[PDB]
Paper text:
The VMXi beamline and its associated PXF within the Research Complex at Harwell offer a highly automated pipeline where researchers provide a suitable protein sample that is used for robotic crystallization, monitoring and subsequent in situ data collection from crystals in crystallization plates or in thin-film sample delivery systems.
The entire LVPRGS thrombin site was also visible in all three monomers at the N-terminus of Δ57aa-NCOA7 protein, due to the cloning strategy for subcloning into pET15b vector.
Numbering used by the authors: 13 to 183
Write the structure that this text describes.
C-alpha cells in the first residue's frame, strides 16, 4: 500500500490507496507500479509526458494533484502518445479521491477513450464533452461528466490547476 519509489504522491498512503489498486484489471494486479514520469523531477510539459511515455511497454496510471491537494486521474490501457485519432480500450477508466475514492469505468456508450493532441491531452468523449483535459503545459486542467465513463467532476470544480502530476507504469 505504498506509492512508487521516488513518487511525491505520498499523501495517498493516508487516503487508502489500495482502493485504486483493487480497481486495476487482473492483468496488472500483483505487478508493482513504478514512477515513469514526474513533473517535479523531469519537468512539466505535454511533450515531455509523451517522450517519457514512448518507451513504456505497459498500461499506465495518471496521478494528478491539483492546487487544492485533491488527487485524481486515470488508468489508461495504452501509454500516452500523440495521435490523429482516439485510442485506448475498454479497461480505461477515470478515478478520483475527492471527496472519497470513486472509479468511473467504461459505459460502453462510446469509445472516445484517449486523444493525444499536440496541444492537449484528453480522456473521455461524447457530444464534444471531455472527461479529463490538460493543456500543453500540464498546468490548466478541466474535468466534466462525459458519456465514455459517466464520471463526476474529478476535483472540487470543473477547472483546476496541476500542482503535481505523475505517470506510473507496471513494466
Amino acid at each position: 500500500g505504498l506509492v512508487p519509489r521516488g513518487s511525491h504522491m505520498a499523501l495517498l498512503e493516508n487516503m487508502h490507496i489500495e482502493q485504486l489498486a483493487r480497481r486495476l484489471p487482473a492483468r496488472v494486479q500483483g505487478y508493482p507500479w513504478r514512477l515513469a514520469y514526474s513533473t517535479l523531477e523531469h519537468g512539466t510539459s505535454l511533450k515531455t509526458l509523451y517522450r517519457k511515455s514512448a518507451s513504456l511497454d505497459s498500461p499506465v496510471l495518471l496521478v494528478i494533484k491539483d492546487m487544492d491537494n485533491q488527487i485524481f486521474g486515470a488508468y489508461a490501457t495504452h501509454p500516452f502518445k500523440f495521435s490523429d485519432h482516439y485510442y485506448g480500450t475498454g479497461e480505461t477508466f477515470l478515478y478520483t479521491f475527492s471527496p472519497h475514492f470513486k472509479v468511473f469505468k467504461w459505459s460502453g456508450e462510446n469509445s472516445y477513450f484517449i486523444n493525444g493532441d499536440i496541444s492537449s491531452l484528453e480522456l473521455g468523449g461524447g457530444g464534444g464533452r471531455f472527461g479529463l483535459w490538460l493543456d500543453a503545459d500540464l498546468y490548466h486542467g478541466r474535468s466534466n461528466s462525459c458519456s465514455t465513463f459517466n464520471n463526476d467532476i474529478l476535483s472540487k470544480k470543473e477547472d483546476f490547476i496541476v500542482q503535481d502530476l505523475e505517470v506510473w507504469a507496471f513494466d
